[PDB]
Amino acid sequence: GVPIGDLVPRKEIDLENLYGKKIAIDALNAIYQFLSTIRQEDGTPLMDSKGRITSHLSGLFYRTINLMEAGIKPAYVFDGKPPEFKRKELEKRREAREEAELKWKEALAKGNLEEARKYAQRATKVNEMLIEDAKKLLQLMGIPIIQAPSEGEAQAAYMASKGDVYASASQDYDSLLFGAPRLIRNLTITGKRKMPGKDVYVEIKPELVVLDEVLKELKITREKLIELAILVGTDYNPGGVKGIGPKKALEIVRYSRDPLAKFQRQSDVDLYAIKEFFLNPPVTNEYSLSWKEPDEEGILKFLCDEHNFSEERVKNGIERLKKAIKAGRQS
């Protein structure tokens, strides 16, 4: 996402005023919030006996369930073929003999000394397998799992720009750029918000960002909110125009009609291409939200006979979501 965090206004909330609300949750984010938070007391990410990591499974599973126990209903939006926003230069920047596979598979980094999500995200290291166990587990889990044409946050946004949910959920403010009315942050890591942290966002208690208040208290019109964010830098140009920061961009945008204009030559990717994208994102309208329930054996196999989850808790864990899915009254 984009660093325009210090500029967008926020409210509070408790996981009581999400009672009964449909919420679109961008999965890869949710998966990277767990890869960080769900660790061993011995500081390392949960892994299954044969080595591979397991936290985005131990997360996704107990966390959508405790939400659903709170009464929220979630649907995870899945990325499509990511837009690939950079220059041409080699026609097909294909299989560029650089280190594939042994980048993040053995990504030293989740033993966290840094944030190499930024390794996966350049031209390779298909960690699509991480998402593959996640749509897979979500399906037995019962969960609505919307798939999207281009980037997850935008269909997560569109679903909100057409009454299907009350919000997008991600720790990123990229849905405000694709028009999300609401963006609620802190769902996958809401907790006992009290004395220390990872980096503690002290009220790790959900926050409600509203595109109305973000647009009135900083008086810019939505496609200028894109402009600012392009200049500061998006994941489609990871530094922005050399030297501008949130508030200087807040002006350049703010008054000068058509601000991208002055840069582009001042070196980067062709800044107009990206905007267009945040205005007009590729969006699927074909998705059904809830329909079916948890294949427990199918689950004890994937989580214990396959990933050595304790048979024990996930037996008495599917249970809690069965409490949760099957029981929303009728009406």
The token pair that represents 1 in the structure block: 């996402």
Q: Indicate the Cα dihedral angle 101, 102, 104, 106, nearest 10°.
A: 140
Closer CB to a copy of itself, 6 or 128, in the complex: 6
Q: How far apart are CB 198 and a copy of itself at their closest, in Å?
A: 7
Q: How far apart are CB 78 and a copy of itself at their closest, in Å?
A: 29
Answer yes or no: is 172 a known binding residue. yes
Answer yes or no: is 212 a known binding residue. no
Closer CB to a copy of itself, 251 or 312, in the complex: 251
Answer yes or no: is 151 a known binding residue. yes
Q: How far apart are CB 190 and a copy of itself at their closest, in Å?
A: 18
Answer yes or no: is 42 a known binding residue. no
**Distances from the Cα of 7 to the Cα of 203, 215, 247, 268, angstroms:** 18, 10, 8, 24
Q: How far apart are CB 148 and a copy of itself at their closest, in Å?
A: 30
Question: Which residues are near a copy of itself by CB under 8 A?
Answer: 3, 5-6, 9-10, 39, 41-44, 103, 106-114, 196-198, 202-203, 232-233, 239-240, 242-251
Closer CB to a copy of itself, 149 or 245, in the complex: 245
Answer yes or no: is 227 a known binding residue. no
The token pair that represents 244 in the structure block: 């501008």
How many distinct helices (H) and strands (E) make up the chain?
Answer: 11, 5
For residue 289, which phi and psi values (nearest 5 degrees)?
A: -85, -105
Beta pairing, strands 182-185 & 207-210: antiparallel
Inter-residue contact 281 to 275 (CB < 8 Å): no
Closer CB to a copy of itself, 229 or 321, in the complex: 229
| Alpha-carbon span 142 to 10, nearest angstrom | 32
C-alpha Rg value of the chain to the nearest Å? 20
Binding site for Mg(2+): residue ranges?
26, 79, 151, 153, 172, 174, 235
Binding site: residue ranges?
26, 79, 151, 153, 172, 174, 235
